[PDB]
Coordinates of C-alpha atoms in Angstrom, one line a residue:
X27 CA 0.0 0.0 0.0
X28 CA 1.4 3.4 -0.9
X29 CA -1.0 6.7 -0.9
X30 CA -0.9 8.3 -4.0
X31 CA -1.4 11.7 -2.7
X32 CA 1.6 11.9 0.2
X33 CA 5.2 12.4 -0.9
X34 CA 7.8 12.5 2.0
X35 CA 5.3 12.5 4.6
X36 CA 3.5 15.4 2.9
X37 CA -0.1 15.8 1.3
X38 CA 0.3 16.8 -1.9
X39 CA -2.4 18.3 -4.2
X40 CA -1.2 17.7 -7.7
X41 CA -4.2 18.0 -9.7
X42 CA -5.3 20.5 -7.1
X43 CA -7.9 20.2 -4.4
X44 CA -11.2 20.3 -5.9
X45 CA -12.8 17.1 -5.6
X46 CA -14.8 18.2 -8.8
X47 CA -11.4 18.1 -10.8
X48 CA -11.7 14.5 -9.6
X49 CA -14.9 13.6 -10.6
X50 CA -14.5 15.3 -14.2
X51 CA -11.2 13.0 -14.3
X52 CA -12.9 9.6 -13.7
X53 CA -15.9 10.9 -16.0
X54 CA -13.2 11.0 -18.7
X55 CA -10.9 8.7 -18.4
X56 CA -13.6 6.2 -16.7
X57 CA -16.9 7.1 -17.5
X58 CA -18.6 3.5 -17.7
X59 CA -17.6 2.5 -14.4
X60 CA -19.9 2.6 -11.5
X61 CA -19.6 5.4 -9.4
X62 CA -22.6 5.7 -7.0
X63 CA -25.3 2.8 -6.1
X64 CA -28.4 3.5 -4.1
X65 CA -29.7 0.1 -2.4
X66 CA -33.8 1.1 -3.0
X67 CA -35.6 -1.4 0.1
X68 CA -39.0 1.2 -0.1
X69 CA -40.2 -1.5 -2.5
X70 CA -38.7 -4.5 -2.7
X71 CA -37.1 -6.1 0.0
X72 CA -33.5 -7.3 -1.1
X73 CA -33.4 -4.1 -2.7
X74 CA -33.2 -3.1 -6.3
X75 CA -29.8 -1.2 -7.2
X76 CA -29.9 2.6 -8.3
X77 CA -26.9 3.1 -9.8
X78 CA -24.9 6.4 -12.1
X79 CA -22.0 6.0 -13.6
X80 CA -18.7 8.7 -13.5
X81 CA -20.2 9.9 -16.9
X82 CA -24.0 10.0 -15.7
X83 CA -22.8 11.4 -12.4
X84 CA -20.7 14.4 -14.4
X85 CA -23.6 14.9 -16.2
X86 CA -26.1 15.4 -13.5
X87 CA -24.0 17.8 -11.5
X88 CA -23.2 20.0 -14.5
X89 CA -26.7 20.4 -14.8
X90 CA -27.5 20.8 -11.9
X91 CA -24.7 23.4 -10.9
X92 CA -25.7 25.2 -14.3
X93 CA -29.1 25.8 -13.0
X94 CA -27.7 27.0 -9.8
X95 CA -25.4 29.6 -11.5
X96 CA -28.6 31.0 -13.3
X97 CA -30.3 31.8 -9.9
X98 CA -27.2 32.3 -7.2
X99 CA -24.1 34.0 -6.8
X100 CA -21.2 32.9 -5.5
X101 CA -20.8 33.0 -1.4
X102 CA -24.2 31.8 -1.6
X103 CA -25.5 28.9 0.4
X104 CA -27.7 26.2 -1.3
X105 CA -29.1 23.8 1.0
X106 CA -29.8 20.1 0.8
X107 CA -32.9 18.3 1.7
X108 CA -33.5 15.9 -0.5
X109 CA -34.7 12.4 0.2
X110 CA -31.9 10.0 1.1
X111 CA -31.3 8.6 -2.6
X112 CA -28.8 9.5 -5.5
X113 CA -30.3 12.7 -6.0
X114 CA -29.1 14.0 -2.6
X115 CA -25.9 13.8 -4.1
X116 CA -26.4 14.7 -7.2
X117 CA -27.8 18.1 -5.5
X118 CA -24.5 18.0 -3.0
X119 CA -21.9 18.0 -5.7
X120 CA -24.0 20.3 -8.0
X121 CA -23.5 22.8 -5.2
X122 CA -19.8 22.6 -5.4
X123 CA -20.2 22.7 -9.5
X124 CA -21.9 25.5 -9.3
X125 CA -18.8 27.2 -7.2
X126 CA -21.7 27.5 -3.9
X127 CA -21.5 26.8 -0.5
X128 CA -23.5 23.6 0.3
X129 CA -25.7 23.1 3.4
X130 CA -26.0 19.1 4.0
X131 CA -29.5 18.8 5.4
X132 CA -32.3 17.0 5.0
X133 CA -36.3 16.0 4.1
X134 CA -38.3 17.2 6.4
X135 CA -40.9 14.1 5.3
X136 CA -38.1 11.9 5.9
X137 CA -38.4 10.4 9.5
X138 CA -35.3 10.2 12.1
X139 CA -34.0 13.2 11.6
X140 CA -32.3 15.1 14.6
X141 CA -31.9 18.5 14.5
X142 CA -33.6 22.4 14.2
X143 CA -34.3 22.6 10.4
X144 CA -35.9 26.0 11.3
X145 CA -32.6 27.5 13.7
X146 CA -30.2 25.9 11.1
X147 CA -31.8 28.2 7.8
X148 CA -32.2 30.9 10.0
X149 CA -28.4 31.1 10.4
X150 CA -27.0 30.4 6.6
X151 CA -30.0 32.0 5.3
X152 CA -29.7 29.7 1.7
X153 CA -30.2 31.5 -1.4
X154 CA -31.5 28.0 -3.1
X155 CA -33.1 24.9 -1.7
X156 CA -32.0 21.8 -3.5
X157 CA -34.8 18.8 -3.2
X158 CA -36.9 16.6 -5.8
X159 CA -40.0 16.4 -7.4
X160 CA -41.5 13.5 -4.7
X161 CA -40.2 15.6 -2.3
X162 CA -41.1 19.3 -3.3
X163 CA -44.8 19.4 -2.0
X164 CA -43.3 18.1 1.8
X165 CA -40.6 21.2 1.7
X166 CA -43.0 23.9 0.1
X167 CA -45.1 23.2 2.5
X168 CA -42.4 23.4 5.2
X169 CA -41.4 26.7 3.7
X170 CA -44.8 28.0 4.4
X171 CA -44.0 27.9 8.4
X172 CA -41.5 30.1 7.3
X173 CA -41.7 34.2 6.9
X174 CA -42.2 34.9 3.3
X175 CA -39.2 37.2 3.4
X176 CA -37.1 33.5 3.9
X177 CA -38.5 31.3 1.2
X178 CA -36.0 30.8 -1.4
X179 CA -36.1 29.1 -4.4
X180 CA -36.7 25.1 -4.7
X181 CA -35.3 23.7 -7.1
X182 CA -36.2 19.8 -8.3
X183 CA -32.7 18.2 -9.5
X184 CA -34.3 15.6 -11.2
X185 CA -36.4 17.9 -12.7
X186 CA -33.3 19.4 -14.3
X187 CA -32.6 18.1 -18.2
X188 CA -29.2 16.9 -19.1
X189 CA -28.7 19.6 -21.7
X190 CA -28.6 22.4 -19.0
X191 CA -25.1 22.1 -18.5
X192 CA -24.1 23.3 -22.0
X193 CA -24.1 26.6 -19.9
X194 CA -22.0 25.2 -16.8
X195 CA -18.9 27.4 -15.8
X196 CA -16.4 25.6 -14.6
X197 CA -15.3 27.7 -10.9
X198 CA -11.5 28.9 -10.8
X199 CA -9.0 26.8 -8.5
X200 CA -10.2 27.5 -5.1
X201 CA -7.8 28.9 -2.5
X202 CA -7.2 27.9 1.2
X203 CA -10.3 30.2 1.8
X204 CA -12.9 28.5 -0.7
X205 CA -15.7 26.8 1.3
X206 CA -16.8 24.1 0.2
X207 CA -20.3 23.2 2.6
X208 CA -21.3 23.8 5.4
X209 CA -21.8 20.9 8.4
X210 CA -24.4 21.9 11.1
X211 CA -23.7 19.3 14.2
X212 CA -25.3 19.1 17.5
X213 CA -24.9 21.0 20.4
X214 CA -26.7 23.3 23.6
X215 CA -26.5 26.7 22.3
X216 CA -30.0 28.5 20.1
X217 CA -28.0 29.6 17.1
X218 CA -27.0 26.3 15.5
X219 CA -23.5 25.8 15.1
X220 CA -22.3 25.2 11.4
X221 CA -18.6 24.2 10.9
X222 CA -16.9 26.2 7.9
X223 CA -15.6 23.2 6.0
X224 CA -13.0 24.3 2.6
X225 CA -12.1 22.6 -0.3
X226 CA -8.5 22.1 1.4
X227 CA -10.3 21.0 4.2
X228 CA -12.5 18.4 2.7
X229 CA -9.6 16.9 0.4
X230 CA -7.1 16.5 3.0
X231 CA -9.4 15.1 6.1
X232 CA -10.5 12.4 2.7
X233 CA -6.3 11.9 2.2
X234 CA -5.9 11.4 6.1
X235 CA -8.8 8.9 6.0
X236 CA -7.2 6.8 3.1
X237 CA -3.7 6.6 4.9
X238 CA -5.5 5.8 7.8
X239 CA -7.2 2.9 7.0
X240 CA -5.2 2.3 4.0
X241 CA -8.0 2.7 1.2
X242 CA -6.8 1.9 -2.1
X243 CA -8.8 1.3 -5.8
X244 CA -10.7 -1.5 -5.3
X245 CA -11.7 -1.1 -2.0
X246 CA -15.7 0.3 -2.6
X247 CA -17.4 2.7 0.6
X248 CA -20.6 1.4 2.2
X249 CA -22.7 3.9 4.8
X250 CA -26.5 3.7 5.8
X251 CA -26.2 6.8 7.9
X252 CA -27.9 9.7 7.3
X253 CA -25.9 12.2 5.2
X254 CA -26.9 15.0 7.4
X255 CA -24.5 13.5 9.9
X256 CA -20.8 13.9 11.2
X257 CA -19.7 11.0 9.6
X258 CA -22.8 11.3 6.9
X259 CA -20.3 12.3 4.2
X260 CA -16.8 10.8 4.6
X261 CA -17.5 7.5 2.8
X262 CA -19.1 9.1 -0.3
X263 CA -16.7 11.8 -0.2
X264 CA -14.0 9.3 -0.3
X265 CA -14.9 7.8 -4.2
X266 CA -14.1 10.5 -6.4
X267 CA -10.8 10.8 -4.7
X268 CA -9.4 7.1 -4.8
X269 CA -11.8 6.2 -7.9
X270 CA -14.2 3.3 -6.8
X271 CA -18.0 3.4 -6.4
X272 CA -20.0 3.9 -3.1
X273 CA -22.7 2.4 -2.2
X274 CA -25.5 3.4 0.4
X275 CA -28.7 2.7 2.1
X276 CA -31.5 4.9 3.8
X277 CA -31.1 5.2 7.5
X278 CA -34.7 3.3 8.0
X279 CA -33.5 0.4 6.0
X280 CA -30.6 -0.6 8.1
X281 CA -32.8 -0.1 11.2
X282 CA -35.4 -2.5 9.5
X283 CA -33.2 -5.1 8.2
X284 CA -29.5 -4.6 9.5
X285 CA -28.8 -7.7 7.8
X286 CA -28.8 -5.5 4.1
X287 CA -26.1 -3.3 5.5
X288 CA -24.2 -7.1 6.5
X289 CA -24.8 -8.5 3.4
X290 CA -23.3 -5.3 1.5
X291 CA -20.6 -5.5 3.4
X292 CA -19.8 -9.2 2.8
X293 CA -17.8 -10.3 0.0
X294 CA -19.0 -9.9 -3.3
X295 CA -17.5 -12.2 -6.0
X296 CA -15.5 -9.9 -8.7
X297 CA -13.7 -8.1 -5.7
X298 CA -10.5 -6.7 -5.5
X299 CA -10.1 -5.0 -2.2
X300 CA -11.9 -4.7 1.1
X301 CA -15.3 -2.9 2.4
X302 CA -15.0 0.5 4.2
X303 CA -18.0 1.7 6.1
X304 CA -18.9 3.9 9.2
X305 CA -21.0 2.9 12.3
X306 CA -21.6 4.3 15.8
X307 CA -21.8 1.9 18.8
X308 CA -26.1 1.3 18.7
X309 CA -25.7 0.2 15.1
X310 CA -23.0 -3.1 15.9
X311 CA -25.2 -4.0 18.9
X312 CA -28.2 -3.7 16.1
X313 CA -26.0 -5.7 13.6
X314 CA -25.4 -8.5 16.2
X315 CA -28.8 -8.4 17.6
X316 CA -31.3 -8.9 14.5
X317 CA -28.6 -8.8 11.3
X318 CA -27.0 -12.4 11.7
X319 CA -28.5 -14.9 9.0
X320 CA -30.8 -17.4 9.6
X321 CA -30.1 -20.7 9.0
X322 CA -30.7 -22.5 5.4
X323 CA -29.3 -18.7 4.2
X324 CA -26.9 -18.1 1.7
X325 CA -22.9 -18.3 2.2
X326 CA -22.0 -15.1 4.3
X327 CA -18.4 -13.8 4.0
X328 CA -17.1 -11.4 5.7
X329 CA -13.1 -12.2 5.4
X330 CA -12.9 -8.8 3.2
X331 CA -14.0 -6.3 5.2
X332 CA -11.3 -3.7 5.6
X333 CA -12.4 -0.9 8.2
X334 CA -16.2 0.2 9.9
X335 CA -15.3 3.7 11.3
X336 CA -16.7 3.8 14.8
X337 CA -17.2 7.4 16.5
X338 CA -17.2 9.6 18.4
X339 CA -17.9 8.2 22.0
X340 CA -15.9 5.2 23.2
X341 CA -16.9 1.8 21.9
X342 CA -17.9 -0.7 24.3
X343 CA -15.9 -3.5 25.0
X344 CA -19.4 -5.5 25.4
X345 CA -20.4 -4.5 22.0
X346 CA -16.6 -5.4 20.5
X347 CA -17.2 -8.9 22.3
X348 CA -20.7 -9.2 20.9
X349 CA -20.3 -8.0 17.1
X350 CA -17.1 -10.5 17.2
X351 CA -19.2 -12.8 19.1
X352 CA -22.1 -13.0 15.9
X353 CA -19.8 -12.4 12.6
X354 CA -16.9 -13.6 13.7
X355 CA -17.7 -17.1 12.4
X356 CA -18.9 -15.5 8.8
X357 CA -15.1 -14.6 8.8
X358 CA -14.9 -10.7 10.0
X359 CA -11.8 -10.1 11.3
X360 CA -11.8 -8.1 14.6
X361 CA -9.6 -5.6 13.3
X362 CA -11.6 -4.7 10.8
X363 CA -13.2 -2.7 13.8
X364 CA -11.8 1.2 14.1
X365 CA -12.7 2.9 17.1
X366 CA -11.9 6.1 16.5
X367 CA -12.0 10.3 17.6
X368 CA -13.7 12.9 15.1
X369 CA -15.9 15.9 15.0
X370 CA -16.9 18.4 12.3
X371 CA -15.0 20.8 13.6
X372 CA -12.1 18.5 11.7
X373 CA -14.0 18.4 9.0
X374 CA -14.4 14.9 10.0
X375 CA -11.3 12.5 11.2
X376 CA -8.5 12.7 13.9
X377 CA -7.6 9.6 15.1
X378 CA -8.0 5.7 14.5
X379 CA -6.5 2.4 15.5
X380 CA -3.4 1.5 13.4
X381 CA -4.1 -1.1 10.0
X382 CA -2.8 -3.9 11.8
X383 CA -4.1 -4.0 15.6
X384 CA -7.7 -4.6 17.2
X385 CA -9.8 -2.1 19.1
X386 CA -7.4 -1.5 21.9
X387 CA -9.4 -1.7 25.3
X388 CA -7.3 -1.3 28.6
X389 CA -8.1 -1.7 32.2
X390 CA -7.8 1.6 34.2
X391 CA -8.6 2.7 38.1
X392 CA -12.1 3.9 37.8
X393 CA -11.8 6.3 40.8
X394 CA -8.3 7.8 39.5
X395 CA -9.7 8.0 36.3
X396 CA -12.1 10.2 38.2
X397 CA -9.0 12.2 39.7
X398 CA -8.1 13.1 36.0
X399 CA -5.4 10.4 35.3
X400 CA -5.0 7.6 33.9
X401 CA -3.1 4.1 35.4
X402 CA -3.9 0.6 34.6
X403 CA -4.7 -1.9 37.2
X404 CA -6.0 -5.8 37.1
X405 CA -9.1 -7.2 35.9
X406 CA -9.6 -8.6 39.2
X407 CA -9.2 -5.2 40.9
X408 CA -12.8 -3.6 42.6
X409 CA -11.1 -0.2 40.6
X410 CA -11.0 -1.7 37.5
X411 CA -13.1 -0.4 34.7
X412 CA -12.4 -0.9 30.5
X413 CA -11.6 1.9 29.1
X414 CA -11.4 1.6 24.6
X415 CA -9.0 3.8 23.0
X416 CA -8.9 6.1 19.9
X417 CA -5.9 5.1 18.8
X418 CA -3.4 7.4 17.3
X419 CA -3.7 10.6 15.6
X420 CA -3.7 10.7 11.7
X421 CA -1.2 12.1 9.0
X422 CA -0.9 15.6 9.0
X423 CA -2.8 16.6 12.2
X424 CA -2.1 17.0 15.7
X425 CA -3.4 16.6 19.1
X426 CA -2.3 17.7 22.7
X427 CA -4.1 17.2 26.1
X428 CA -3.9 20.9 27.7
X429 CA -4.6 22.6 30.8
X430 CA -7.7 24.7 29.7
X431 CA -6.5 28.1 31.1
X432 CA -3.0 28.0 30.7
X433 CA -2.7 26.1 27.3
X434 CA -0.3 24.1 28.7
X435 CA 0.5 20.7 27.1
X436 CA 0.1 18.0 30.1
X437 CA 2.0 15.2 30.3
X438 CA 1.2 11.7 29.3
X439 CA -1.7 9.9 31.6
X440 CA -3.1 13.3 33.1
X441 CA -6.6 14.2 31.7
X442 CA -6.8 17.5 30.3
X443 CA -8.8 19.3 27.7
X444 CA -8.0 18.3 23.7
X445 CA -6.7 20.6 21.3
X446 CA -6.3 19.5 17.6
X447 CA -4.5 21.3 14.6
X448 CA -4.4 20.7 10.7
X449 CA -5.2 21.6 7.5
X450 CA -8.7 19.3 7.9
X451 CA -9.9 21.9 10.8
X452 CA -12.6 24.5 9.5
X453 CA -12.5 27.9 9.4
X454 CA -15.1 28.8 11.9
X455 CA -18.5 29.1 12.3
X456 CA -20.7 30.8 9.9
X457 CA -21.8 34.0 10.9
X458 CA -20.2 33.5 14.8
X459 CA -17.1 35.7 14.3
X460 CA -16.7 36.1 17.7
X461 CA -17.3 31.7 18.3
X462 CA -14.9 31.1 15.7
X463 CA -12.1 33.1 16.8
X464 CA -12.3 31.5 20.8
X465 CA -12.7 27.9 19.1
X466 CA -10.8 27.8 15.9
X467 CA -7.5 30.2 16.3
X468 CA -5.6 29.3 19.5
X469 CA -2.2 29.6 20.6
X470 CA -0.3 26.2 22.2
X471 CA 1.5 28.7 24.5
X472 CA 3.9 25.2 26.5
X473 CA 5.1 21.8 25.5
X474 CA 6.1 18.9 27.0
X475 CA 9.3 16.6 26.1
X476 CA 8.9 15.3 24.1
X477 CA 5.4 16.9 22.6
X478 CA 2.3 15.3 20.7
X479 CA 2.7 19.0 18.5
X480 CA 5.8 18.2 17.1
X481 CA 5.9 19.2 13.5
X482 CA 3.3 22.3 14.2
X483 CA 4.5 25.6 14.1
X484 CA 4.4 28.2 16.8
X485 CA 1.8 30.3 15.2
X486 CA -0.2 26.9 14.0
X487 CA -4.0 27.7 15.1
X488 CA -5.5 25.3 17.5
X489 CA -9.1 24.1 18.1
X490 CA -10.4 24.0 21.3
X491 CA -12.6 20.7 20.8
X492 CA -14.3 20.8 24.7
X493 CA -13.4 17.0 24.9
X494 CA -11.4 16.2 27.9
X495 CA -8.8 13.2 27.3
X496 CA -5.3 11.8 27.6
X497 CA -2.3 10.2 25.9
X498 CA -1.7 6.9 27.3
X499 CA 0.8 4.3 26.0
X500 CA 0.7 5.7 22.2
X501 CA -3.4 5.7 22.5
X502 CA -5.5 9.0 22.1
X503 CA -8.2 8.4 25.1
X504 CA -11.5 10.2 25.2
X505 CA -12.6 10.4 28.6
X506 CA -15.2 13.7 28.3

């Protein structure tokens, strides 16, 4: 495995950054291959494929985006809520066609969604709302809750001809500065908080990804999760830049069947390369619970799964044992489980578990974990509590457990607060100047010896995540 986009340790951007550049390349060079698959369960239920090519994909964004450059102008923001099918992506990446900022949301029919669709317009006030035909009656009518002064335009995508993009204009080369979408994630405070994500930041959190779990050509992305989501975007996000297809399900269909998102992962016969998907900790439990094949079913094997990105919060070591516990004898290799540390604010990932090694789980004092520090004791102990790690921080990036107040780097074991740097972290939050500048642009101002910010700069900006953790052993550790 070599990753075609670091030289000397370095990400390199060649062909640029624009992960449209990448798409138009595969649309040339490529353009019969599969690119995106959506597994359709709302009629059938083994699914029927809905799939679009590099060729069909390019061709669907360009008319998209060309429909968009009619109607916006650039620094607008054009929200998402389509249904979860191809069309939501078709309608993500015409966005960034179009040269527009993109607002990942989604249907207000659609079920299961979490989040204020009304707090998060109000504060990127969208020039364009991106949906489809089945789904434009369900957002109008949304819209009318709405003042009238904040009803933009909706815009079908599939309602959009081919031909439109005879009239697409190709954006410049975005800069550092460029942003690409913006990703609304959860939190306490009214004004919803909406992570500036660039072009730069998007294409090297996808690089660090790849190195990470050492995606090459031939390995093909799986997600059910919602795309509104912190890791709603990563897997699809990750084709156009190492040039396989994705494939993905709604949210509902995993929920109904887990065994479909199972099943997709196993090995299919024609493949060259492993299965990378995401899941938090409910959905294994959910796997192992109701998604194991009956008996009489059809071989089952899961020897080819690469990586299933599990974040943010610690995996369980009862739900490692259990998941290994059902698909282990289908073949899944417990490594093939990555506990890992991300948040929007890095535009997605930090830190994973390295290729080779299991979820590492360690037995700490519970009461001195308490204190703030971190020492390993004995099963047996009446202290003793399992504590997973996070494993080690990606390509690129850095972490370092400070004292809040000081920003002073703490050394190894003591609990502190965790501050993270790269060219993956986002450039605020739209329209909190004042947020941005307290989270986003902080000064490491002491380091340890050695330090976890080696290789950063003295003037490199720091984000303040609000996580509290610690370095233990060579393992990131996220305690709060």
């Amino acid at each position: 495995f070599h990753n075609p986009f670091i030289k000397d340790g370095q990400i390199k951007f060649p062909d640029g950054s624009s992960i449209v550049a990448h798409v138009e390349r595969w649309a040339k060079v490529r353009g019969d291959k599969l690119a995106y698959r959506f597994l359709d369960f709302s009629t059938e239920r083994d699914g029927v494929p809905r799939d679009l090519t590099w060729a069909q994909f390019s061709a669907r964004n360009r008319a998209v985006a060309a429909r968009l450059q009619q109607v916006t102008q650039p620094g607008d923001r054009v929200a998402i809520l389509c249904p979860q099918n191809l069309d939501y992506l078709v309608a993500f990446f015409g966005a960034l066609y179009a040269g527009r900022i993109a607002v990942p949301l989604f249907d207000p029919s659609e079920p299961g969604h979490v989040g204020r669709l009304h707090a998060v317009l109000d504060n990127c006030h969208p020039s364009a709302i991106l949906t489809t035909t089945e789904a434009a009656e369900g957002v109008r009518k949304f819209f009318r809750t709405r003042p009238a002064n904040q009803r933009p335009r909706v815009i079908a995508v599939d309602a959009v001809p081919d031909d439109v993009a005879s009239t697409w204009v190709n954006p410049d080369e975005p800069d550092e500065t460029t942003i690409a979408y913006l990703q609304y994630t959860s939190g306490s405070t009214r004004i919803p908080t909406g992570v500036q994500i660039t072009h730069l930041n998007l294409a090297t959190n996808v690089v660090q990804v790849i190195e990470a779990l050492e995606g090459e050509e031939g390995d093909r992305g799986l997600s059910w999760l919602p795309f509104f989501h912190d890791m709603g975007l990563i897997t699809a996000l990750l084709a156009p830049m190492i040039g396989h297809y994705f494939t993905f399900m709604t949210p509902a269909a995993f929920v109904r069947r887990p065994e479909r998102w199972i099943r997709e992962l196993a090995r299919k016969e024609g493949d060259t390369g492993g299965t990378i998907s995401v899941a938090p900790n409910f959905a294994f439990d959910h796997a192992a619970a109701r998604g194991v094949p009956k008996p009489g079913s059809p071989p089952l094997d899961l020897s080819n799964v690469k990586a299933v990105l599990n974040g943010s919060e610690p995996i369980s070591a009862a739900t490692v044992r259990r998941f290994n516990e059902a698909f282990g004898p289908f073949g899944f290799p417990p490594k093939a489980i990555k506990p890992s540390y991300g948040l929007a604010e890095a535009t997605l990932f930090v830190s994973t578990t390295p290729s080779a090694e299991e979820p590492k789980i360690i037995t700490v004092d519970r009461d001195q974990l308490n204190s703030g520090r971190i020492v390993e004791v004995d099963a047996d102990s009446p202290k003793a509590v399992a504590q997973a790690s996070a494993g080690k921080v990606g390509i690129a990036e850095w972490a370092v457990i400070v004292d809040a107040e000081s920003a002073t780097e703490l050394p190894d074991g003591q609990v502190g607060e965790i501050w993270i740097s790269g060219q993956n972290m986002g450039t605020g939050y739209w329209g909190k100047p004042e947020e941005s500048v307290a989270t986003f642009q902080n000064i490491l101002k002491s380091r340890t010896n050695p330090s976890h910010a080696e290789g950063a700069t003295d003037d490199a900006t720091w984000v303040r995540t609000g996580d509290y953790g610690a370095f233990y052993d060579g393992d990131l550790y996220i305690t709060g």
